A paper describes a structure:
One of the T4 early gene products produced immediately following the genome injection is gp61.3, also known as Spackle. Spackle, along with another T4 gene product Imm, confers the infected host E. coli with resistance against secondary phage infections—a phenomenon known as “superinfection exclusion”. Our results show that T4 Spackle forms a stoichiometric complex with the lysozyme domain of gp5 and potently inhibits its enzymatic activity, whereas Spackle does not appreciably inhibit the cytoplasmic T4 lysozyme (endolysin, gpe) responsible for cell lysis at the final step of the phage lytic cycle. Crystal structure of the Spackle–gp5 complex shows that the binding of Spackle induces an allosteric conformational change in the gp5 lysozyme active site and partially blocks its oligosaccharide-binding cleft.
Residue numbers in the entry:
A (entry chain A): 175 to 341
B (entry chain C): 23 to 98
The structure:
């Protein structure tokens, strides 16, 4: 499932942390704000609206159930946007579920617009040229910056199964 | 691996304390098993982050922490 896949790749936090670009994050890779904001009063205010109850603390916490709710909403927003995208959508419809999960994993990490930048990879996947797709994904700066996760994801694209996640 | 104490703590403690512990566990496993991967692991932790490994390291009984090196840098 995507929940077990993204829990592994994104970790699980019940208290805010800041990602490598400085953005406040919580749960399973849930971006609270798309600014590099350190203001806890601002962070708490936004997170309170997102989970449905007043968050206090420096930092405050959410419950495990709130983390799951945030993830389920995040995953649906992404899945909705990946099918509708004019470039990524056609590829998603043409590949099997394992490979859809690989594209959804990338979209969760970098956004659909980020996935849309892999023109050579996506063109190769639509053509069924999995070796060229694999090589294009591992040629990228994304592979150099998050090599463990990108190795797992590109291996799905190459092989068509989920063995790189132990499945 | 699973450790009840480290699991909940890594989910809730201050980020700097948690990432100090995560990096220490990872680097200790690198030095024990694959010392030549030290520079690559350090590079990957800086460019890719370290918080995300809290679940596999402390919350997942089915993940063998010896495999954390390949989790950070890819298949060996």
């Amino acid at each position: 499932s995507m929940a077990e896949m993204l829990r592994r790749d994104e970790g699980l936090r019940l208290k805010v942390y800041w990602d490598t670009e400085g953005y406040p994050t919580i749960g399973i890779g849930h971006l609270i704000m798309k600014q590099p904001v350190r203001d806890m009063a601002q962070i708490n205010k936004v997170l309170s609206k997102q989970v449905g109850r007043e968050i206090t603390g420096n930092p405050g916490s959410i419950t495990m159930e709130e983390a799951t709710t945030l993830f389920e909403r995040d995953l649906a927003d992404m899945q909705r946007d990946i099918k509708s995208h004019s470039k990524v959508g056609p590829v998603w419809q043409a590949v099997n579920r394992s490979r859809q999960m690989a594209l959804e994993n990338m979209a969760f990490q970098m956004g659909v617009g980020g996935v849309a930048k892999f023109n050579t990879m996506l063109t190769a996947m639509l053509a069924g040229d999995w070796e060229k797709a694999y090589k294009a994904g591992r040629d990228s700066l994304w592979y150099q910056q998050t090599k463990g996760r990108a190795s797992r994801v590109t291996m799905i694209i190459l092989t068509g199964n989920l063995e790189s996640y132990g499945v | 691996g699973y450790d009840k104490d480290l699991c909940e703590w890594s989910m809730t403690a201050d980020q700097t304390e948690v990432e100090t512990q995560i990096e220490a566990d990872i680097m200790n496993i690198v030095k024990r098993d694959r010392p030549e991967m030290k520079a690559e692991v350090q590079k990957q932790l800086k460019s890719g982050g370290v918080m995300q490994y809290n679940y596999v390291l402390y919350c997942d009984k089915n993940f063998n922490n010896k495999n954390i090196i390949a989790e950070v840098v890819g298949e060996l």
